[PDB]
Each structure stands twice: as C-alpha cells, then as structure tokens.
Symmetry: D2
Subunit: 253 residues, 4 copies
C-alpha cells in the first residue's frame, strides 16, 4: 500500500477489462488514480467502489477531451506521475480484402494517435515529477496475427513509438515503456468470442494457446504496470511481455 504512495496516475480506458485491473493495482499501491473512459457505466461504478480513484469522462480521440483530462487532473491533485495508455480496440476478424483504408484510419486514431495525444499533453507535467509513460501494446504487434492487418499494424506502431519517445525523453528523466499482453480474459475477449460460430470452442482455443494453459487476468497486467512505474527505474524503452508464453515455440513441396 506504499510502493507508489503520493503519486497521481491516469489510466485511459480504465472502466473495464485490463484498464480496470490497472486502476485497481495502482490504488492498491497507494496512488491516486484518474479513470478516463468514453463510457460512463464501468468507470463511474469504479469511482464509487475505490477510495482514491475518480472518474473523468474522456474520449482519447477528441483532443479537447484529452486537454481537459490533463488540466482537471492537475487542478484536482496537483501533480501527474504516470500515464497508462490502455484505451484501444480489436475489431472483429477481417480478411485483408474485407478491410478499408477508412476503417484503418479510424483504428489508428484510437490505438495510436490517442496514445500520442495524451502523452504529448502530459509530458510537461511528467518532466516536473520525473514521471513515466506506460503504453499497452500487444504481442501480435511483434509476431503478427491472422485476420487483423489493421490491428496488428497499430500495435506495431505503438511498440516502436515507445522506443522513439524513450530516447527523446531520457535526457529529462522520463521513462517510457510498454506492456505487450497476450490473451487476457476481458469483456472485449468475451464480446469477440460471442461473434464466433462456436463461442465456447473459441474460448477453449484461446486458453490453450498459452503454454500456461489459461488466459491472463487484468490484475496480472496491472502488477506489471505498477512494477514499471514504481520499481523499474533503469528500464526505459522496453516491451514487457505478459503472454503466458504464447510466443515460445512453434513433405517439402
């Protein structure tokens, strides 16, 4: 309850799923947390549940929403120590010829440019606090996936951007790192599985895709985030895999 005491953290998409687990992990560490989400339902309930967490409605694709997010965080808590760029989306499976340039642009707006915009607006305050940035990317940005060309491209961009910004901000003492989760059991996972012909088979396949034989939990991503913020003081520009081992391991005509 003291590892990140006195610190102020913003978690985008913190109303459910991974983001809510990150929120819980930081509150449990002693931090005050600002839950950003475009949806009221989960984040408002989370603010009532957790002393030390508050909810601010904010769509990270709307620059003026993000400006107000940052200015309200400073107005209410007087400092900013860590930004967790978790808001993002995975579309349903799509064959390459079923994708569109305009759909790709929209997904870039959320998964890439919303992370960019909050980070840019927060960096002046992070420099004052010697704070840090944590981006939530994905394993499939590193190794690829099927029926997801736009999603994979956006996460490859997030991981690379993390390394570029780590270089730029290192002279000012601001660390920039990312987490690449694999299959984490969240409402997004549940929603996508429900679109499949056999949802229960899809979930079983998802569980067995990891050597550890289960999907991950939001709380496990949250523990990795608290580590990066509070104890990884010589880490910058890293990609922390939270995947259960999915990337490990695997007539001529």
């Amino acid at each position: 309850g003291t590892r990140y005491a006195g610190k102020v953290v913003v978690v985008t998409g913190g109303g459910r799923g991974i983001g809510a687990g990150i929120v819980r992990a930081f509150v449990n560490s002693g931090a005050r947390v600002v839950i950003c989400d475009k949806d009221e339902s989960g984040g408002r309930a989370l603010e009532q549940e957790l002393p030390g967490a508050v909810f601010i409605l904010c769509d990270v694709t709307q620059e003026d929403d993000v400006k107000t997010l940052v200015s309200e965080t400073i107005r209410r808590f007087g400092r900013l120590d860590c930004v967790v760029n978790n808001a993002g989306h995975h579309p349903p499976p799509q064959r390459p010829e079923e994708t569109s340039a305009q759909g790709f642009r929209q997904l870039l707006e959320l998964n890439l440019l919303g992370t960019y915009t909050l980070t840019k607006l927060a960096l002046p305050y992070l420099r004052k606090s010697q704070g840090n940035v944590i981006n939530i990317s994905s394993l499939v940005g590193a190794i690829g996936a099927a029926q997801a060309v736009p999603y994979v491209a956006t996460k490859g961009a997030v991981t690379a951007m993390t390394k570029a910004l780590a270089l730029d901000e290192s002279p000012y003492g601001v660390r920039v790192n990312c987490i690449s989760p694999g299959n984490i059991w969240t409402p997004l996972w549940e929603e996508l599985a429900a679109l499949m012909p056999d949802p229960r088979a899809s979930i079983r396949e998802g569980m067995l895709a990891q050597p550890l034989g289960r999907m991950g939990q939001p709380a496990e991503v949250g523990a990795a985030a608290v580590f990066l913020a509070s104890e990884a003081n010589f880490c910058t520009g890293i990609e922390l895999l939270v995947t259960g081992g999915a990337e490990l391991g695997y007539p001529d005509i």
Copy 2:
C-alpha cells in the same frame, strides 16, 4: 539476366534513391518493371535509360492513382508478380513537442496507408501468379531513433503489417516480406544532411554509425529485393536487415 525473367514488378517511389536501385536490380534480373513515382523528373529519365522499365506517374496516397497504376500494369504487361512498396519519407528531425497529430496522420498516409492500398489492389493479381510483396520498412522501426516519433511509429507499423499479411496470404501462396535498411546514401539522406548546422559532419557521423564504416547503396537494397522475390521461396513474414551492422552492440546515480 534470367533469375526473374518473364516477371512483372511494380516499384513505388522508383524515380530516385533506393527505389531506383531496386528498379535497376530487377531489370538486370530479366524482369519488366513499372516505375511508380509522384515526381516525373527521375522516373521519366529512368524509363528512357532502361529497356524493360516504363514510368507511370502515381501518388500512392491517392487511391484512384493506385487503381490506375494496377490496371495499366495489367493492360500493358498481362500479369503482376511482385510489388515493392518503397515510396516513403523521413521528415526533418523533430522533438516530440514539435510534432503534430495532423503531421503524424499525413506521414501515416504515405509510409503506411499507401503501402496498404497498393498491396490490397495488387493482391488478386499476385494470387494468380503466386507472386509476392516486398515492403521497405526501416531499422529504426525495430530499435527506435531520436527526434522522429512519427517516422519510427510508421515503420513499426509497416514491419508488423508485413507479418500479419504474410499469415493471411500464406494459404494462397503469396509471400509477404520486408527489408529494413539502415543508413543508405540517397537524395533524401543528402537533403536532410544539408539542413544540419554542419552537413559534412552529419554525413561523417552517418558513415561511422555502421561497423562496416560506410553507408549502404541503393544497389545493395536492390539485390536483397531480387533475392526475396526470386530465390526466397520458403521465406514469408521476415524482416531482412540491410544496415551494415548498425543494430549490433552498444557512476550508478
């Protein structure tokens, strides 16, 4: 002169620099080449110089330009075997706070979405020929760079997209690979160096950034592309580094 005989290749941004070297390499291999560029000057001269190469004016950010590029290639040569997505740009060095969301969007349009659009429109013809895609990414997408957050993000996206599409197109026999060059001596390199306080010092630094002690040549990228198209039949989804060893190698408070 026979390694890629009878084949038809499209090279975007083929009017100068790396793209022109790729054009030359494929002509030397026996292929017919379509030089795509938004600028007339270099590509028109290249078409007069090289029997087997022709020039088509096409801005890869304009979908109707790319549609006409593909339909004219098929109309004139009857098949399409390889697309080399080389068109791209590196902005001048920019601190993160000096970048803009709108500038980032524009660079994504060229470096990422123009590659996406040509590949999408070409894939029906590549499936008929069991052809292949070669994307020109960058080393800095993998390891980062300073004063280039948008550029690095776009190339991280290209490399990841390459792996996703390789998975999607493998059942149809179409390979999708990328080349990640390091410092290659091109007109873009010369133009950026000329913006520096000391251009000659900037070039010297660029030469010594590689263990091999020089910058690369467009012809060397071109040889790597001809290898991927004509001889790498068990390679798909790879990132071929052409960097001179730049990524190799490198009080407590």
Copy 3:
C-alpha cells in the same frame, strides 16, 4: 516486507555485486535466502548482516557442491520456491584470435552449465512449490559486443535455454524467466575498468552508453527479480531488459 513472505530463495554468486543486491531485495520482500558463492568473504558478512539470509559455500561448476547446496536448503528450510542463477564471469576484453577453445569451455562451465546443473537439481522441489527459475543473462547475448566472443556466446545460450525450459516446465506450473542487464556498477565492472589504459575514461564511457546517462545498480536488478518471482504469474520464458535503454537507437564505398 510481505510480497514474498514464507518463501525460500537460492541466489548463486550472491556474495557481492548483482547477486548481493538480489539477496537484499528478496530479504526485504520477506523471503528466506540462501547465499551461494565460491568465495567466503562477501557472503559470510552478508549472512551476519541480514536476518533471514544464510551463507553456503558452493562452486556452481562442481556438481557435488550443488547437490549439497540443494539438500542443505531443504534440510534447513523445508521448501524451495525460487532459484536465481546469477553466478557468472566476464573475462577481460579478448580479440577472437586471442581466445582459446579451452578458455571457451571453462566459461561455458560457469556461465551456462552451472545454471543448468542447479536448475536441474532444484526442479523437483520447484514443482512441489509451483516455484520459478530466474536466470541472469546479459544484453550482449541479444545484440552482441566486441572483444567478447565466448562471453556473448554463453549468454546467448542462457537466454535461449530459458525459453526451452519454460516450455518444458509449463505443464507443471513452474515459470522460467531471465533478466538481461546492461552496464551495472559492480566489483566486476570496477575490476575490468582497472585493467584499461585509462580506467576513469572507461567508466565514463560506460556511464554514457545508456540514454539514462548512468549505470544501473544491483538493487534495480534485484527489484526486477522480486517482480518475476512474486508478481509475474502470467510471465514465462521472457527476457526482462534492465539496461537503461542501451539497445535503443544507433560515403557509401
């Protein structure tokens, strides 16, 4: 003081440097720690200093020493939860033609096979406790280094071995991970620098090799180890970089 309470940890080479920092981190987390070292001096003093740590003289290249290490840990503390394979050595800088096959074999014995032997003898007890293995590898195993062919080869082997064993032990609930440090200020660093023509210049160069502008501390490696043991329950087979950003970032004839 409770994150790893009730747990028993063995740290090889725990008498000084990184190993001693790992020992301190685990004691501070609430664990009981067995300090293994071939040298009495530092580890004996550490055992007097730290309630909860004890010293066992053991050369990890001597199989019977390691057998007795494991059997004494179980005899004295009744369980084994985590093995940290930290013992290792970096020879002085050596040109490739100055190395020998026999020198290479000796370095493999310490850096690779001593890690293998302790892990093998500990695994039956780790399976009973659902414990975990943490190997201390090196950044240069991933990216290379000059004048160190044998050292680099041994650490490449440790990192790969970590992934293989993670796959083999995942069905039994035992996680296997590694830490790849960059420049950490330790007595080994101090000893190597003292062999250089200008030691102070060598240290200054070492500090500036990181974007963060300093070398790392043993305590920072220790915090990463405690994270992997106590909170990274969905991580197996990962390589956790603790390098200060050294791997980030960087006429044609």
Copy 4:
C-alpha cells in the same frame, strides 16, 4: 553460374541434408567447394557427381582435422572466400531431467565449438580475400522448443556468437552472418521421425507447423547462403530466417 565465380567455399557437414544443398548451390554459382564431413558415404559420391566440388574427411570436433582441412584447401585452391558452418546435430527429444551435463558438453562441442574452431583457423585467409562466414543456426535458438534444452542452448549460442564476431571482424572487411532454418526435410528429420510412435503423423505435423504448409528444402537454404556470400555486401551480424513463417502468430485461472 557466375555470381560467385573464382571463389573458394568450405561447407562443413556437406555430405547430405542442408549441407549438400548448400554445396550444390555454390557449385551452381561458379564457386569451387570443399565438402567437409565426418562420414565418407555422401560426400565422396557428391565429389564424383559435381565438377568443382571435392571431398575432405574432417570431424569438426577434432582440432587437428580442422587444421588440415584449412591447410589442404589453401594448398589445393590457393585462397579461401567463405566458410559455411553447417555441421551439427539434433538429439532425440529429451525431457530436461533426462538430459546430462556430459551430453550437453558433447553437443556444445559439435554445434558450437566446431563452428568456433573452423572460423578461427579460417579467419586469416578470409581477411586476405575479404571473405565471409555463414553459420547455420536454428529458429528454435530464438523462440525455444520443447524436449530440447541442450540443442536450443547451442543454437542460441551460435546466433549470439555470430553477432559478436561480426563486430570484431568488421574493421577487416569480413562479414559474419547466420541462417536460422525451421523445418527442413533432410535425413536428420527423417531419422528423428522414425523414432516416433507414429512417424507419418510426426511428419504431417511438421509440414503443417509452417503457414506455407510444407517443410523447406536444402536448396532453399543453399540459395540463402549464396545470397549472403555473393550479394549481401552491407549485411553483417544478421540472422536470416528460412522457416516458412513458423515464428509468425500463435478461463483465466
């Protein structure tokens, strides 16, 4: 037939499998080739078959054999341009507790130290010719595999060693690169499959482990080697994947 004309190449383990395909590729490129193997049967027949190839009996684990290999190559052909370190072995599948330190040492002798020894003895001649080294590593050194801790460790060592030596030899103009194959259909693959309960099922599984839906051919590894030797003049320290896409791609308790 001219890409590597006038050049002299040594291929270890060239009597069958991948090595024989590399031999054939270099002869087809115009080179003279020395086939090194510990076994007479395949290499002697290959020397009768191929004008331009000769056979020298040599066990790469025996330093005096390798000394004589190099001195006989120079005595017979007057130069040395490329060494392909292909000799190696994969043991039958072994659980970690079924391995031994002594078995691990023996596999290191072949897969790692035999590559080291030939490279060391050849480097003085490679510097005179501005020649190059090609090591045959494995995909599983990078991503791991099950029931193969020693094999995976040896190939992780080869890949890392490649990068270290590339740094050391770059000032002398000698490039050092590796190829990491995935499933290639060779006599070793056939022998291992025959030990399985259902050999035909094992082979079918091996074919489908690649997105491309088949195993690779020795000729495809050979084409990659000829590219690295003859056309990759700005590549050093790279790992060229020849895997068919195996590394691509893939309730909470």
